[PDB]
Amino acid sequence: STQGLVQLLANAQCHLRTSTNYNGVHTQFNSALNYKNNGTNTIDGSEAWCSSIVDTNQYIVAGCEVPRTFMCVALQGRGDADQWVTSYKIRYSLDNVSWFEYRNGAAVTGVTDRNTVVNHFFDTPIRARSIAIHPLTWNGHISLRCEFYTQPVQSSVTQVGADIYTGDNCALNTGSGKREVVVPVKFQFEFATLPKVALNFDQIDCTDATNQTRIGVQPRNITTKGFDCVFYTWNENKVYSLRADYIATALE
Amino acid sequence: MSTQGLVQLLANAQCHLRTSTNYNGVHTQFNSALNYKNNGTNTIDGSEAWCSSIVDTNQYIVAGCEVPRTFMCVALQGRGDADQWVTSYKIRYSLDNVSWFEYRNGAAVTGVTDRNTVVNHFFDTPIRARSIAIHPLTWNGHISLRCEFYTQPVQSSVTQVGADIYTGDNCALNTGSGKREVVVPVKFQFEFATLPKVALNFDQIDCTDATNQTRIGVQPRNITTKGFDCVFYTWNENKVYSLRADYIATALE
Amino acid sequence: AMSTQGLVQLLANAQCHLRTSTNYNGVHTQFNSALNYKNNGTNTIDGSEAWCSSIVDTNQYIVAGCEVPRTFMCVALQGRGDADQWVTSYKIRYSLDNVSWFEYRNGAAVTGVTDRNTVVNHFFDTPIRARSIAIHPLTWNGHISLRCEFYTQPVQSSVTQVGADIYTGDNCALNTGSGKREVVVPVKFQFEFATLPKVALNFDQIDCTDATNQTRIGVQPRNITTKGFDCVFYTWNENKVYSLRADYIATALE
Ligand SMILES: CC(=O)N[C@H]1[C@H](O[C@@H]2[C@@H](O)[C@H](O)O[C@H](CO)[C@@H]2O)O[C@H](CO)[C@H](O)[C@@H]1O
Numbered sequence: 181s182t183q184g185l186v187q188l189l190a191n192a193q194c195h196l197r198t199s200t201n202y203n204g205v206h207t208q209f210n211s212a213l214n215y216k217n218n219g220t221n222t223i224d225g226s227e228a229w230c231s232s233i234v235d236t237n238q239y240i241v242a243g244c245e246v247p248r249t250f251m252c253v254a255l256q257g258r259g260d261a262d263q264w265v266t267s268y269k270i271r272y273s274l275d276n277v278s279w280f281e282y283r284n285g286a287a288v289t290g291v292t293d294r295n296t297v298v299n300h301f302f303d304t305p306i307r308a309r310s311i312a313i314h315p316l317t318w319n320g321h322i323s324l325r326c327e328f329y330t331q332p333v334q335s336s337v338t339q340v341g342a343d344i345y346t347g348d349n350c351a352l353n354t355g356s357g358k359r360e361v362v363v364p365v366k367f368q369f370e371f372a373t374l375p376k377v378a379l380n381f382d383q384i385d386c387t388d389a390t391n392q393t394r395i396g397v398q399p400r401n402i403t404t405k406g407f408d409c410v411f412y413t414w415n416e417n418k419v420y421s422l423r424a425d426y427i428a429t430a431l432e
Numbered sequence: 433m434s435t436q437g438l439v440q441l442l443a444n445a446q447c448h449l450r451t452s453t454n455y456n457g458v459h460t461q462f463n464s465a466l467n468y469k470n471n472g473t474n475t476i477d478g479s480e481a482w483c484s485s486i487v488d489t490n491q492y493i494v495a496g497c498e499v500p501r502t503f504m505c506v507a508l509q510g511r512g513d514a515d516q517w518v519t520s521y522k523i524r525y526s527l528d529n530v531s532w533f534e535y536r537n538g539a540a541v542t543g544v545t546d547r548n549t550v551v552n553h554f555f556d557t558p559i560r561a562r563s564i565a566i567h568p569l570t571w572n573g574h575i576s577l578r579c580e581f582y583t584q585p586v587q588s589s590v591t592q593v594g595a596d597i598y599t600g601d602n603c604a605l606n607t608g609s610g611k612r613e614v615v616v617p618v619k620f621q622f623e624f625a626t627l628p629k630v631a632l633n634f635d636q637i638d639c640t641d642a643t644n645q646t647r648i649g650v651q652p653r654n655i656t657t658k659g660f661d662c663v664f665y666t667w668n669e670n671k672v673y674s675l676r677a678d679y680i681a682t683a684l685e
Numbered sequence: 686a687m688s689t690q691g692l693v694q695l696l697a698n699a700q701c702h703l704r705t706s707t708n709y710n711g712v713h714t715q716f717n718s719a720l721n722y723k724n725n726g727t728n729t730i731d732g733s734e735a736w737c738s739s740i741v742d743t744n745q746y747i748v749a750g751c752e753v754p755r756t757f758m759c760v761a762l763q764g765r766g767d768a769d770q771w772v773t774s775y776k777i778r779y780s781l782d783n784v785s786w787f788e789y790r791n792g793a794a795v796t797g798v799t800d801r802n803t804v805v806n807h808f809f810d811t812p813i814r815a816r817s818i819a820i821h822p823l824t825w826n827g828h829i830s831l832r833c834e835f836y837t838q839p840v841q842s843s844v845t846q847v848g849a850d851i852y853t854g855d856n857c858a859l860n861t862g863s864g865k866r867e868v869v870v871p872v873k874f875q876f877e878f879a880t881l882p883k884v885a886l887n888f889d890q891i892d893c894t895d896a897t898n899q900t901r902i903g904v905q906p907r908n909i910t911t912k913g914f915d916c917v918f919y920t921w922n923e924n925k926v927y928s929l930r931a932d933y934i935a936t937a938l939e
């Protein structure tokens with residue numbers, strides 16, 4: 181059901197803040213879906229995050245700095261004792277300034293035992309940075325393991341460079357046939373992966389040839405460090421000058 | 433009111449928190465958020481503060497963000513359940529996480545004078561940083577605190593560049609009269625999470641004037657999260673042999 | 686320090702979330718995992734100078750997760766500061782998309798440490814591009830206890846805004862007169878950038894008259910600030926320009 185989605189807590193993709201922790205071995209360190217610990221030693225605590233205050237004001241918040249599309253939240257009870265959360269509300273924030281509630285704060289169905297996971301796919305996927313589970317009803321104690329499942333994210337880095345220029349009365353302004361003027365370009369910083377480059381006109385100064393305009397600009401020899409900006413014309417056209425801006429973007 | 437419109441980093445779980453030392457497993461940074469309160473009827477859940485284990489002028493709590501922020505303010509508060517608080521501190525920060533810097537060249541910032549009354553420090557100039565640290569310099573009783581950092585809201589963009597969308601040589605714009613269009617569907621390499629805006633501009637032009645007039649255009653139509661229709665066009669009596677464009681599509685948040 | 690100079694120390698800079706398989710107890714957790722972490726040697730209650738697992742088997746791990754992709758150059762391993770416990774070999778696993786995971790060297794063991802405090806660096810055969818990375822201890826002395834660091838290339842963060850269809854209007858002022866002539870259209874970005882952007886501003890629609898067979902048209906930003914810029918459309922000489930349209934791309938760094 182969750183194929184192709186990111187398991188946020190399993191991949192350590194969020195910070196976890198809780199309202200309260202029962203003690204130092206019942207914390208959010210123990211909150212991942214299917215977390216299991218040493219069943220022969222009591223000292224490592226609970227197979228769950230468990231609160232210290234038992235009321236309807238507790239919560240665990242997962243925060244991402246990069247916005248995510250949340251598809252599903254999975255809840256699970258406590259692995260080593262009969263404590264589990266039977267319903268909960270979801271709150272979330274995209275800008276980390278205003279918070280909203282899923283279903284206007286209505287309860288979502290939780291679990292009924294220690295280990296059987298209950299997935300909730302949100303009615304509409306939720307676009308958010310931070311998301312919180314607020315237990316509303318429970319068996320025994322407020323104790324849970326959980327996961328959030330998000331669409332995979334993509335990360336880009338873009339560099340813009342302005343005003344790459346042929347010069348006045350450039351080599352395109354004499355001769356005939358295919359002709360080019362090459363201007364090397366160095367990016368401000370080196371990209372981590374090979375960028376794609378858009379390179380488009382902002383200033384055109386050219387002569388038609390039997391009423392035809394023929395002008396072009398294209399990158400060549402694109403690397404992580406820069407590229408060659410190739411201005412060109414062809415046929416009998418005489419082009420005094422061309423200027424272009426570029427946009428270079430690398431992914432992941 | 434003073435921090436209205438700003439992001440409360442710790443409250444929003446926007447940073448990782450590393451400490452120099454923790455008194456024990458119930459005095460950790462899990463207890464550090466401003467106004468954190470716990471079970472006052474049970475001792476086992478520990479302090480209403482992060483408390484260090486070593487008491488000297490070398491302790492700290494570091495908040496780390498991967499996405500750069502403009503830090504407006506840091507708020508300090510004492511320990512909720514005992515008379516322990518930090519009376520002055522210094523601030524260090526890093527933008528690139530290689531070089532670190534000291535706010536006010538390491539000079540002291542005024543802290544708090546009681547358990548619960550928050551003292552906000554707005555930085556003399558806002559600090560652009562990824563990571564930021566509070567280094568207690570003086571204290572009452574023990575090095576124990578709750579805190580918050582307040583940043584401007586961040587925006588996140590994702591950009592895709594696509595090169596060389598082309599009409600073809602001697603395209604349909606090279607015949608006829610009036611408004612004429614050649615449509616080239618474009619599919620982005622990946623689907624955006626939200627609707628992008630698209631810039632789509634010329635990189636090669638091969639066209640004939642009409643009574644000395646040049647008339648050429650290119651424009652996206654039907655932009656979705658998956659792609660768009662690249663519409664090349666001319667109008668009036670102009671004949672256009674070919675046009676080429678590159679696009680830049682960016683989605684926010 | 687010299688061998689990793691100029692690289693980002695992830696844990697030291699609090700750049701990652703840390704998830705462990707198990708923690709011995711609440712004072713043996715990943716809070717104690719940073720390279721060279723040292724604690725109160727006079728008081729036992731603050732625990733170990735290491736993350737120490739609760740289960741001692743080949744299924745333990747510590748995961749470092751970053752939301753922004755990094756180029757991982759090196760992993761440093763260190764033993765426990767306060768007891769004779771350390772990890773003698775381990776495997777490295779990682780993921781870029783946080784869906785599919787991969788094993789470094791097809792899961793072969795990487796050499797760990799031989800004592801409490803002497804750090805052993807492993808520079809990856811090829812730098813690893815990833816979001817999340819995990820240390821899986823394979824062999825150990827005494828217990829599974831470690832301090833560690835990951836070193837990455839510095840990251841750059843950009844924010845980009847695209848705005849479409851900035852227009853002179855039909856039959857604009859460039860369509861009369863002689864000499865250098867400009868039509869200025871102020872542009873406000875949808876949001877204010879945190880730092881000064883660079884701006885690409887390029888044509889998407891051209892409606893102009895040649896002059897003695899010459900085309901002379903231009904567009905350029907002026908007075909770029911964090912909030913916006915003036916879009917300056919222009920011609921010169923005897924050219925008459927009915928209209929010009931442009932799209933912009935503005936990007937701010939760090
Ligand atoms: C390669 C090239 O020049 N193609 C252009 C085409 O040019 C042709 C010449 O190749 C041909 O020899 O003579 C023609 C007139 O007799 C014309 O110059 O011109 C096309 C527009 O009609 C188009 O501009 C091609 O770029």
Ligand SMILES: CC(=O)N[C@H]1[C@H](O[C@@H]2[C@@H](O)[C@H](O)O[C@H](CO)[C@@H]2O)O[C@H](CO)[C@H](O)[C@@H]1O
Nearest residue numbers: 645646647667668669856892893894927928
């Ligand atoms: C709709 C159109 O083609 N507008 C262009 C305008 O074209 C005009 C025609 O509308 C009119 O019928 O006849 C005129 C010549 O008498 C001319 O063709 O021309 C403008 C430039 O002068 C501009 O190019 C408009 O785009």
Ligand SMILES: CC(=O)N[C@H]1[C@H](O[C@@H]2[C@@H](O)[C@H](O)O[C@H](CO)[C@@H]2O)O[C@H](CO)[C@H](O)[C@@H]1O
Nearest residue numbers: 385386387420421897899900901921922923
């Ligand atoms: C300043 C200018 O308009 N430069 C363009 C140049 O214009 C020259 C004039 O400088 C000169 O005074 O007169 C010439 C005609 O007799 C011509 O207009 O023309 C260049 C192309 O040949 C280019 O367009 C310059 O931008």
Ligand SMILES: [Ca+2]
Nearest residue numbers: 342343382425
């Ligand atoms: Ca420009």
Ligand SMILES: [Ca+2]
Nearest residue numbers: 595596635678
């Ligand atoms: Ca191109």
Ligand SMILES: [Ca+2]
Nearest residue numbers: 849850889932
């Ligand atoms: Ca456009």
